[model samples]
Target: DARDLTAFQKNILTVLGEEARYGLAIKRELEEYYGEEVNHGRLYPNLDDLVNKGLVEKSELDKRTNEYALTNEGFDAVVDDLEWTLSKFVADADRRERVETIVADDAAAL
Candidate 1:
């Protein structure tokens, strides 16, 4: 089943995709990339959400900030979730529609 990723969670992912960044580093990237409107209130909770989902792993960084790295699942999800999201934008993306249709049709034929 597809899971819901909050907008901030997705943002956290965009930063993580760039590199391993600790709390402040990730915060700066989010603000710089998305602009000043971004805040830690939104960012940290979503980071925690990603960590909870097993997409991100957190570790100590000099007793101040906690660094995050993408787990294998996270890397795969960057492909899968983003592709799933992309597929939605282009309704006629033949490969995705075809595969999903075939899978559903096969189940029906069973």
Candidate 2:
């Protein structure tokens, strides 16, 4: 479940959401986004964990490279997590707007 995955794992899923990518490609994506090198010790194991959890499938691309693809369950997990998170913001905006309007009105009255 997405709930059980950490932020790093979720990011990996997001990167792989579009297509299968080799380990180096995934690492580069994260490094580019994060603006820092992602340690191999951290990246590989997390990928392995995702594989173990059935959220991703690992395939050998060549002699020294492996490809990771998001499974249907993984896609569903990402969609579910995004929907849940976005719903909160979408619903909260109405309340936030109302509170800000009330505060502004009170300040003007003062």
Candidate 3:
């Protein structure tokens, strides 16, 4: 089912994999991802896409909701998402550490 999500959402997943972050912080990391600024209205809607699909475990983070836990099969889903987006990923080495050392060690084509 996860295969249906777009890379933008998975990119959001990579940021979440880094750990619990409020909405703003999430977009900041996303800014780092593209080396450009993130618009004000893009993150939440798609993140909710994951939240509803059960890919992201949701909870309170203030004016609305924010969290991470996977609920059940998320790590694998994240793993799958990353595999596809490994086609294009970055920010830091520890980034992948947050993902799994990515065993695709030599997989750096970014």
Count of backbone clashes for each model?
Answer: 0, 0, 0
Better by TM-score, candidate 3 or 1: 1
Model 2 lDDT on a 0 to 1 scale:
0.89
The candidate scoring highest on lDDT is 2
Reference-based lDDT, each prediction: 0.77, 0.89, 0.72
Q: Rank the candidates by lDDT, best first.
A: 2, 1, 3
Candidate 3 weakest lDDT stretch, 10 residues: 101-110
Q: Candidate 1 residues 1-110, lDDT tens each?
A: 22467666776776787688888888888788777767767777778878888999999877677899888888777778767776675577686687778769988997
What is candidate 3's lDDT per residue for 1-110, written digit by digit as tens?
A: 87766878778777777576777778889999899988867888877778888878777766665555454565687777656676456557866575565555545743
Q: Indicate which candidate wins on TM-score.
A: 2
List TM-scores for all candidates, in order. Answer: 0.68, 0.79, 0.64
Estimate the lDDT of model 3.
Answer: 0.72
Off by over 4 Å in 1: 1-3, 85-110
